[PDB]
Amino acid sequence: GPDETLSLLADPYRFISRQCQRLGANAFESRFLLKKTNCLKGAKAAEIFYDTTRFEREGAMPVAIQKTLLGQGGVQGLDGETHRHRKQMFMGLMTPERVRALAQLFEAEWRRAVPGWTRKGEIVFYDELHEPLTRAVCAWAGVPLPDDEAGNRAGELRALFDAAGSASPRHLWSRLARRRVDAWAKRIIEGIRAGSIGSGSGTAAYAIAWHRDRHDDLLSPHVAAVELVNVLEPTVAIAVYITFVAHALQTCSGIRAALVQQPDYAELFVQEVRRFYPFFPAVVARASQDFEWEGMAFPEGRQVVLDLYGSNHDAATWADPQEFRPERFRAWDEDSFNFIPQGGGDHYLGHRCPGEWIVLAIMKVAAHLLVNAMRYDVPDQDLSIDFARLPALPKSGFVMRNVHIGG
Ligand code: HEM
Numbered sequence: 001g002p003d004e005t006l007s008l009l010a011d012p013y014r015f016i017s018r019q020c021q022r023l024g025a026n027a028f029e030s031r032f033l034l035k036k037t038n039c040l041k042g043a044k045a046a047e048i049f050y051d052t053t054r055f056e057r058e059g060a061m062p063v064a065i066q067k068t069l070l071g072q073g074g075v076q077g078l079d080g081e082t083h084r085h086r087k088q089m090f091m092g093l094m095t096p097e098r099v100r101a102l103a104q105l106f107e108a109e110w111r112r113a114v115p116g117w118t119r120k121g122e123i124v125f126y127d128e129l130h131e132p133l134t135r136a137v138c139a140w141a142g143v144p145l146p147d148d149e150a151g152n153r154a155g156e157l158r159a160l161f162d163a164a165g166s167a168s169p170r171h172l173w174s175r176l177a178r179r180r181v182d183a184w185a186k187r188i189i190e191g192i193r194a195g196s197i198g199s200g201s202g203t204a205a206y207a208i209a210w211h212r213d214r215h216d217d218l219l220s221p222h223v224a225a226v227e228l229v230n231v232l233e234p235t236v237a238i239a240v241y242i243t244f245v246a247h248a249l250q251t252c253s254g255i256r257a258a259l260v261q262q263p264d265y266a267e268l269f270v271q272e273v274r275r276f277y278p279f280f281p282a283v284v285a286r287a288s289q290d291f292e293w294e295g296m297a298f299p300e301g302r303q304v305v306l307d308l309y310g311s312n313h314d315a316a317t318w319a320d321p322q323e324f325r326p327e328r329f330r331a332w333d334e335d336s337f338n339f340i341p342q343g344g345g346d347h348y349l350g351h352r353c354p355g356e357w358i359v360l361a362i363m364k365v366a367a368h369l370l371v372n373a374m375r376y377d378v379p380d381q382d383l384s385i386d387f388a389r390l391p392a393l394p395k396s397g398f399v400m401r402n403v404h405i406g407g
Pocket of ligand 1: 232359
């Protein structure tokens, strides 16, 4: 076939569902870089994608992504019992009490950043989110963060995912940021192991520093560093969803009123933000053995891409996926395959994001503050979603003016 890399890069979120619409199917054979790729979309496709007897991640991860977005040696590259034992380390972090502690730290950091925002008079809301998230998640994770370094660390953490998917010299910064952040986290792990850093027994950094693998060995300091960044970086990336929260409040009538007066609405709202808005485009795996599925060949070694955005906008699952309607979540059956903004399947037995509880609790804090606490004006701007950007954002970055707080 022809190489469709540039077409994908031009339309990362929609490329797959669009061709699926053109072809009248939930899957199509394509080619990105050198490799023939099966592209899949929808609930049934996701379910076979998460079948670990048919798919592996080891031979999947494009090694320019490990130099920016993910690091080398982390949980995303693992399969089988090695993966499950590493994944359990992340899952133990996510108790309701610890998730709530992080949400509270973030609300306090949001409230502390507001006087700064007022004094600026006008802010790019997205730009302003990285630092309070960095301060909160570092504190929560037992990562010391001096006051005068937070701004810089936040910038480096942001560069890992926002300068990563960037067809620009911004890629060089992303790579330097990765080496800097990995070296920084490694010094954190080393200090914890030597006893010069007193991170608490319940914190991410402690758990990761002291984790023993299936051979009863500590992770090498660099692998532990990568796994710690796998907590810090994606927590900072919640800036994107918080920006989408403000965007929904501004562009969809009735949403604000419902949030203020209906206590159960907020949970429905944050879920619909995750379903509706583009964030993580697609996940990649490799077929581990020859099989056939719905007339399509999956030879051993075939790269397979599961389209998350398309699956989240699948009309067989949702009725009117194109509409933004939190109420749709009253009727959701909690299926692990038909709603997949951060992966599908089981958290313990597959690669599904262990960050979902944190994302939900932090988006709830955001929605609460933006309706019950924050006061702000929204000038004329281009709020349209930039579907060509990774991550996608309102083109303006959501601009606020005259910002102040209450309690
Ligand atoms: C900010 C919004 C987030 C989005 C859009 C997102 C999305 C995703 C997606 C699509 C995957 C891959 C699932 C797969 O490979 O099948 C993933 C995995 C992962 N996420 Fe997130 N996530 C977010 C937040 C978080 C947070 C807050 C954490 C903090 C702990 C986190 C930690 C991880 C880790 C460690 C993995 C790898 C898990 C594995 O391979 O088993 N993520 N996420």
